[PDB]
Design a protein around this ligand. Structure first.
Ligand SMILES: *C(=N)C1(NC(=O)[C@@H]2C[C@@H](S(=O)(=O)c3ccccc3Cl)CN2C(=O)C2(c3ccc(Cl)cc3)CC2)CC1
Length: 215
């Protein structure tokens, strides 16, 4: 694989979004991966609706603003036959009744792929597929306060994760990093991005539950 990748320079990635006061990280991670795969398939980047996922993917196992899984969101898109654009179905930061309208569906998938639990496997996926949804342990104030540089937290878990984000690339100086898009707005971190420690024993569990949709 290449020494470095940045899918933003290829047109795969929308600007940084803000989930606000709603536990919807999973939905932003999912739309980020689906934005990237839709662009791979069609050559058109269209911002996708997280609210659609929050309101409507309960049947697949998601819990709205209380949390959920990117894989459940990918399954919903399959089961549902589509997903509405961000423009058609704007973000409210609160759970509401489902208002999906197929007329405004701009994305679809035929399931998802769970990458095996190796950073080598995740690197190959990022290099070949596009942006990848990942689970990480973000339950440390060092993550909340992150501003710049390569993020390394001594107390991070490789096994227990609590935040879904999106890997959009990786790069180098040891001190290799994953280039991660977060959903906390552009004021957090490096314009809303964070560089996470790469090839340091699966730091923060970033290769523990990586996935993307089948498109
Ligand atoms: C987002 N604002 C919050 N975090 C979550 O919803 C996270 C997202 C995923 S995860 O990426 O942590 C993960 C963890 C383990 C295995 C796979 C994945 Cl994708 C799940 N989140 C959770 O907080 C948990 C969860 C799991 C399943 C459901 Cl339906 C709800 C919640 C607790 C694991 C809300 C802060």
């Amino acid at each position: 694989a290449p020494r470095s990748v940045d899918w933003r320079e290829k047109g795969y990635v929308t600007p940084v979004k803000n989930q606000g006061q709603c536990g919807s990280c999973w939905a932003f991670s999912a739309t980020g991966a689906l934005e990237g795969q839709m662009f791979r398939k069609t050559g058109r980047l269209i911002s996708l609706s997280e609210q659609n996922l929050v309101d409507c993917s309960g049947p697949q196992g998601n819990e709205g603003c209380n949390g959920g899984l990117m894989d459940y969101a990918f399954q919903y898109v399959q089961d549902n036959g589509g997903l509405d654009s961000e423009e058609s179905y704007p973000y409210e930061a609160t759970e509401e009744s489902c208002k999906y309208n197929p007329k405004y569906s701009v994305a679809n998938d035929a399931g998802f792929v769970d990458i095996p639990k190796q950073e080598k496997a995740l690197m190959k996926a990022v290099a070949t597929v596009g942006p990848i949804s990942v689970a990480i342990d973000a339950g440390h104030e060092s993550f909340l306060f992150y501003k710049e540089g390569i993020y390394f937290e001594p107390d991070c878990s490789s096994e227990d994760m609590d935040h879904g984000v999106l890997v959009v690339g990786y790069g180098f100086e040891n001190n290799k990093y994953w280039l991660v898009k977060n959903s906390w707005g552009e004021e957090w971190g490096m314009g809303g991005y964070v560089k996470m420690a790469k090839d340091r024993r699966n730091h923060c569990g970033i290769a523990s539950a990586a996935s993307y949709p089948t498109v």
